[PDB]
Scaffold this active site. Structure first.
Site, mmCIF file in Angstrom:
data_model
loop_
_atom_site.group_PDB
_atom_site.id
_atom_site.type_symbol
_atom_site.label_atom_id
_atom_site.label_comp_id
_atom_site.label_asym_id
_atom_site.label_seq_id
_atom_site.Cartn_x
_atom_site.Cartn_y
_atom_site.Cartn_z
ATOM 1 N N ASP A 80 0.789 -1.131 0.009
ATOM 2 C CA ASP A 80 -0.070 0.094 -0.054
ATOM 3 C C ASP A 80 0.738 1.205 0.230
ATOM 4 O O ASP A 80 1.914 1.214 0.408
ATOM 5 C CB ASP A 80 -0.890 0.043 1.247
ATOM 6 C CG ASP A 80 -0.033 0.123 2.510
ATOM 7 O OD1 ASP A 80 0.655 -0.901 2.622
ATOM 8 O OD2 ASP A 80 -0.561 0.781 3.189
ATOM 9 N N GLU A 173 0.870 -1.533 5.596
ATOM 10 C CA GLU A 173 2.190 -0.810 6.478
ATOM 11 C C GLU A 173 1.661 0.616 6.894
ATOM 12 O O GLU A 173 1.981 1.096 7.988
ATOM 13 C CB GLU A 173 3.288 -0.947 5.728
ATOM 14 C CG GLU A 173 4.658 -0.670 6.404
ATOM 15 C CD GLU A 173 4.638 0.664 6.830
ATOM 16 O OE1 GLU A 173 4.299 1.456 5.869
ATOM 17 O OE2 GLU A 173 5.243 0.962 7.817
ATOM 18 N N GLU A 174 1.309 1.264 5.795
ATOM 19 C CA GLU A 174 0.766 2.836 6.210
ATOM 20 C C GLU A 174 -0.289 2.878 7.215
ATOM 21 O O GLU A 174 -0.277 4.153 7.703
ATOM 22 C CB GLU A 174 0.503 3.458 4.713
ATOM 23 C CG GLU A 174 1.480 3.409 3.746
ATOM 24 C CD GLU A 174 2.832 4.136 4.202
ATOM 25 O OE1 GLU A 174 3.678 4.450 3.238
ATOM 26 O OE2 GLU A 174 3.053 4.336 5.424
HETATM 27 ZN ZN LIG Z 1 7.460 2.157 3.519
HETATM 28 ZN ZN LIG Z 2 5.844 4.734 4.199
#
Ligand SMILES: [Zn+2]
Ligand SMILES: [Zn+2]
Ligand SMILES: [Zn+2]
Ligand SMILES: [Zn+2]
Lengths: 408, 408
Positions: A80, A173-174
């Site tokens: 992402d 992850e974001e």
């Molecule tokens: Zn990253």
């Molecule tokens: Zn990042």
């Protein structure tokens, strides 16, 4: 080592922006689009044990090239792009043999400038890939995905010895869900690296210890004209608490290795108020000291309040510094450093003023430092990358895999 | 002077609670219910020039009893009850010859107590009218409405000389709309009194000068790990502003004639914050001084901010102290005081730490002090009144009208 660029642009063309506060993982359909594409490409490549979980995490294995007892290593990238700016209809801009001027982003008043970003003067001669100025690029972390994918093509199609190589591509992850559902057991890697760092040379293995400190203040409201010795103003307590927090030990005034307290938000009325503080510190002791300090500050302001008026603190640990977990096994950074030197790169090791999925995984049984990607200015329209830096990331990954088998 | 009690209980039985932030005036249908009832009763009484505006304000005139050039005077009451507690299904509790104990409110754990309200020991022997403990009473301001209505019955049915008497019953006093649409021209009163005060003896003609001070703070947010010399925390400025406001000059620490600054509410993030302050002061000069102080405090904190980060103040005057407008004409308070003495009452004159519709009207061409009602503990379930105090309010109104004609 071809299709690096092609894979990259292909991934960049897909909208994979994440979404805060969603219960479903991945939080957006776009991410499943890229995960499915990767899945297919892995199959076509010939990797084994390819699997896409219901939570959207893609895993795969490239079998050992040679025999011997070689530890399996892994490479991880996230799929992402940041919610902070759109990764919608990205229109990449390729600047060959950048000569050092200002780069016009698309048609309009937008510019990538060496005045604003001195790094550019460190990239003369290279091919830059920028945005049109209307979005993110996605270098973070699609350059890493491309580099891993590419490193695998190189390992499979060339006379380079290597043990088993595990790869994973994660979803949010974001939005902090990157390592939540990571099946380290299934992954089966002795250690790994996230290919989610910055410029050429970057190698990171130290991150903040993090905690949130929430404060609930209950005061006592009454009509103001007759509040003498009766009214307990909750905001007055909030301000008194924040007055006691070190303005020199704040984000606006810290750098490198110095921790801090930060007031993210606060809202209240005379009757109630709430504060959301964060505490960052590389040192586990001074991290503890920082919790103490807040609780202490709280007590002070909580002097003598009519037992219907109180101040409550709720401290939640978010993540820890991997340093310990990583350094505990010398070969991890030794191999990565030797690999960069073998590739004529000077290893640059700066601490991460924040965290990474690698730091979460390092506590889940998978020591996992961060490898560079060659991308810069991560979350905005000024994000860019250089093909040479991306090719070096590939070179490093491939070398690390070769070196690992050499010692196995 | 009969039906005082009856009129009172009748009005108390009607739900006339007001509603904050409504555009329509009156804000609730219940108020129109009581206004229509009053309208009818005025007609039946025989008053002249009775009119109910589209904005729900009821006016009426009882013609002069005698000849002579006597100034027309007026009496004003408001029809709605506080939003702060329900005036829904009020169930009055009548305590004859109160002996001084604790009063049980309805069936349950609720009590009117002399320990909590020492005033009770000042009302031995009287008839108390309380709530069941589940609501407001409505004494404020339905006792005033009843007292005015009653004073008119007495003036019309007895040999008491009087000039023209104007009466008005207004809609959203509780939500600040009490004098907004008041047609002082149509009312036609040389001066008036609001019958919206407290205990027997109360006469008020001094109120706060009031202003709101809104502050808009624009800071600069950025990821915390890299905010050095870049991030401008807006909440840090809010706290620094409030840190400079006198904690000794606040509602929790002022009484009688001392003004104050009060932080009603504040909300913000690193990027933006907002504060809503109020300033109260009996003295027009020190009221000005108080505005200056805030603006000054603001400047200080606004030291040197990158011209995208600022602090804006918006000062709005809400109302002024009538003192000047009232005292300007001696007969107003002189008559009211003489009237109370004629009725064997000691005039008690305390300043109003807040405002009244009378203070608004006093600036619209109708000097208008506040007359007592005999009710106490205005906005809660502990609100109560005594029949004797209500009968004295009637006596005073009637005397004031007689005295006014005497001097005319
Ligand atoms: Zn990253
Ligand atoms: Zn990042
Ligand atoms: Zn009231
Ligand atoms: Zn009132």
């Amino acid at each position: 080592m071809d299709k690096l660029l092609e894979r990259f642009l292909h991934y960049v063309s897909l909208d994979t922006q994440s979404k805060s506060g969603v219960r479903q993982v991945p939080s957006t359909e776009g991410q499943w689009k890229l995960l499915r594409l990767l899945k297919q490409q892995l199959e076509e490549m010939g990797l084994v044990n390819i699997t896409l979980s219901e939570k959207g995490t893609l895993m795969a294995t490239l079998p050992a090239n040679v025999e011997g007892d070689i530890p399996a290593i892994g490479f991880i990238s996230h799929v992402d792009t940041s919610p902070d700016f759109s990764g919608k209809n990205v229109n990449p801009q390729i600047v060959e043999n950048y000569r050092g001027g200002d780069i016009a982003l698309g048609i309009g008043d937008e510019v990538l400038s060496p005045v604003m970003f001195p790094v550019l003067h460190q990239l003369l001669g290279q091919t830059l890939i920028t945005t049109d100025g209307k979005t993110l690029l996605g270098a973070d972390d699609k350059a890493g995905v491309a580099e891993i994918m590419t490193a695998l093509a190189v390992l499979k199609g060339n006379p380079i010895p290597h043990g088993d190589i595990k790869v994973a591509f994660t979803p949010d992850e974001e939005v902090g869900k990157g390592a939540k559902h990571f099946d380290v057991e299934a992954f089966g890697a002795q250690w790994a690296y996230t290919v989610d760092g910055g410029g050429v040379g970057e190698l990171e293995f130290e991150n903040f210890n993090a905690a949130s400190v929430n404060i609930k203040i209950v005061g006592n409201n009454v009509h103001p004209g007759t509040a003498k010795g009766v009214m307990v103003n909750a905001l007055s307590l909030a301000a008194r608490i924040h007055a006691e927090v070190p303005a020199d030990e704040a984000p606006e005034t810290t750098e490198g290795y110095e921790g801090f307290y930060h007031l993210a938000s606060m809202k209240g009325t005379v009757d109630r108020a709430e504060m959301h503080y964060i505490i960052r510190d590389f040192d586990r002791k001074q991290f503890e000291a920082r919790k103490r300090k807040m609780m202490e500050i709280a007590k002070k302001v909580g002097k003598g309040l009519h037992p219907d008026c109180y101040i409550e603190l709720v401290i939640e640990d978010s993540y820890y510094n991997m340093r310990e977990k990583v350094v505990e096994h010398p070969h991890i950074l030794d191999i990565a450093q030797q690999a960069m030197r073998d590739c004529h790169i000077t290893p640059e090791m700066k601490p991460i003023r924040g965290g990474t999925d690698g730091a979460q995984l390092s506590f889940m049984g998978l020591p996992c430092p961060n490898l560079f990607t060659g991308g810069y200015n991560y979350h905005g329209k000024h994000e860019f990358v250089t093909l040479e830096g991306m090719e070096k990331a590939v070179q490093v990954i491939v070398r690390i895999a070769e070196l690992t088998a050499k010692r196995g």
